[PDB]
Structure 1
Amino acid sequence: IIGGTECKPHSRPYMAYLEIVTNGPSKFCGGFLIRRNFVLTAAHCAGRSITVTLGAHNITEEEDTWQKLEVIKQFRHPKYNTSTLHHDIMLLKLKEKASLTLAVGTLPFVPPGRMCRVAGWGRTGVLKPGSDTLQEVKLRLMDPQACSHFRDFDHNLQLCVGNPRKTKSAFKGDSGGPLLCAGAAQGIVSYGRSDAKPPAVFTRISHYQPWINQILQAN
């Protein structure tokens, strides 16, 4: 998260920190708990295996709120496209149902000009390392023409997010985190420019609701 502030610890109890294993070292993403055994995230966060940590704030400092949970199966959207980046969404089924605590719970599951918030442990600058702590930033929902320069951007599939006159943005490591507008998840962090100049492109959750529901029922 670039240009954001540190969250009050545990104030976003649905947030998930993902460590993804592959021919290379671990990579990291965000995500969010939508059922006690399901986490929503981005398709580009798929790997050979994934571990989810719930209840975290400072991810380097173990505490009783932590629940480190095995993922049994990844459900990457079958149409996720590495060329166009369309359909960047994935469900992770946890081995067991998470415990509900003050620090861990599910997330109950908009015109441009509206302000939305996104949280994550990703880089706090283009050349800065990932954050030890959960950060959040408020971003402006933009008209789709604001994202025209992303040539494969599609208004039906995606949200255009972030005033270009502000430096505020999600970035590397924030992939998969929710964008909330009035407390409801509307987007998922997907991609943007390598120099972090806003706006960026988020998956429009509403388009994928039938696919999500279908997975939640077959599994």
Structure 2
Amino acid sequence: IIGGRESRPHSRPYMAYLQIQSPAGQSRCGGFLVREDFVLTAAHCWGSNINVTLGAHNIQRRENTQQHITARRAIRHPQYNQRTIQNDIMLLQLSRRVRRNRNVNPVALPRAQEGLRPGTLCTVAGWGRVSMRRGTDTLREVQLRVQRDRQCLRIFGSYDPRRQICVGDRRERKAAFKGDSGGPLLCNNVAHGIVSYGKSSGVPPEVFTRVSSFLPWIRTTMR
């Protein structure tokens, strides 16, 4: 998280921390629990084999609170375009169910088919890198502003406001950055977006997947 402050421990019990095995190395993402056995994340956080971690805060400590679960399935969206990062939404189904409690229980998705409204302040969170050289052991969070879809249509070649949200004041140093992919964008304690891409420089605005544009496919999939 760029431009943020350390999150209060377990104040956000839906956060997942994904460890991903690639053909050539490892990748690390965030995600969020949307049902007691289901994690919502990004689709470019897919790997052959994915160890999920719930209920953590200091992710580099072997904590009493954490639950370490592997992903039974990794369901990428069928129309996910790798090249343009279009339809960047993946469901992870856990290999055993979580114990609901103080530090592990899901966040709500939106009621049918409402993305967002410009000007709105929302919160994104994750264990992503905080700068070009350092990362975090701990969950950190920053409060971003929803932008007018004009901004992104000028800067990103493949931005689609039907399925994506445009987020982040260009003037502030506030964004989600590397390692935050698949984290939730919360407004009113509802996950309206999934952290997806932006410029490599961290320079806002950046693009989130509009969760509510895939509500039919999420229910279907968990069914």
TM range (shorter): over 0.9
1:135 aligns with 2:146: no
Q: Aligned partners of 1:32, 1:179: CA distance in 2, in Å?
A: 10
1:11 aligns with 2:11: yes
Measured after TM superposition, the shift of residue 83 of structure 1 is 1.9
SS in 2 for 1:82: coil
* 1:179 alignment partner AA: L
* 1:165 alignment partner AA: R
Of all paired residues, the percent bearing the same amino acid is 52
Aligned partner of 1:90 in structure 2 is 90
Q: Aligned partners of 1:146, 1:116: CA distance in 2, in Å?
A: 18
The aligned runs of 1:1-219 (5 Å cut-off) are 1-109=1-109, 110-125=116-131, 127-148=132-153, 149-217=155-223
Q: Aligned partners of 1:66, 1:214: CA distance in 2, in Å?
A: 29
Q: Aligned partners of 1:144, 1:62: CA distance in 2, in Å?
A: 42
TM-score by length of 2: 0.95
Give structure 2 stretches of 5+ with no counterpart: 110-115
SS in 2 for 1:26: strand
What are the Cα deviations for residues 46-83 of structure 1, in whole angstroms up to 9, with x where unaligned?
00100100011011111111100011111000111022
Give structure 1 stretches of 5+ with no counterpart: none
Measured after TM superposition, the shift of residue 129 of structure 1 is 2.9
Measured after TM superposition, the shift of residue 183 of structure 1 is 1.2
* 1:114 alignment partner AA: T
Aligned partner of 2:113 in structure 1 is none
* 1:176 alignment partner AA: G
Once the two structures are overlaid, the 10-residue window that deviates more, 106-115 or 43-52, is 106-115
SS in 1 for 2:25: coil
SS in 2 for 1:207: helix
Q: Aligned partners of 1:142, 1:70: CA distance in 2, in Å?
A: 36
What are the Cα deviations for residues 188-217 of structure 1, in whole angstroms up to 9, with x where unaligned?
000000001000000001110001011011
Q: Aligned partners of 2:68, 2:139: CA distance in 1, in Å?
A: 16
What are the Cα deviations for residues 32-58 of structure 1, in whole angstroms up to 9, with x where unaligned?
001111000000000010010001101
Q: Aligned partners of 1:160, 1:100: CA distance in 2, in Å?
A: 33
Measured after TM superposition, the shift of residue 108 of structure 1 is 2.3
* 1:10 alignment partner AA: H
Question: Where does structure 1 differ by over 6 angstroms across 4 or more consecutive aligned residues?
Answer: none
SS in 1 for 2:192: strand
Q: Aligned partners of 1:14, 1:128: CA distance in 2, in Å?
A: 27
Q: CA RMSD in A?
A: 0.8
Residue correspondences, number? 216
* 2:129 alignment partner AA: R
CA contact (8 A) 2:108 2:189 kept: no
CA contact (8 A) 2:107 2:189 kept: no
